[PDB]
C-alpha cells in the first residue's frame, strides 16, 4: 500500500465587482456646499 503524498495550490481573484462608480459622490457634496454658501 504505497501512500503518503502531497500537493500544490493556486488561487483566483473572485472579487471582480467594481467599486469606483459608487465612490464618486463628490459632486453632490459640491452642490450642497453651493447651497450652504
Amino acid at each position: 500500500a504505497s501512500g503518503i503524498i502531497m500537493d500544490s495550490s493556486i488561487s483566483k481573484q473572485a472579487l471582480s465587482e467594481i467599486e469606483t462608480r459608487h465612490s464618486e459622490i463628490i459632486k453632490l457634496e459640491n452642490s450642497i456646499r453651493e447651497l450652504h454658501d
Binding site: 472579487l15 465587482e17 467594481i18 467599486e19 459608487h22
Partner: peptide
C-alpha cells in the same frame, strides 16, 4: 427608495452609508 448602495462589497461600510443617504 429601499437603499442607495449596491452591496457588491458587503461589509458594514456600505450599510451605514446607505442609511445616512436615506
Amino acid at each position: 427608495s429601499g437603499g442607495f448602495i449596491r452591496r457588491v462589497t458587503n461589509d458594514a461600510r456600505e450599510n451605514e452609508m446607505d442609511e445616512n443617504l436615506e
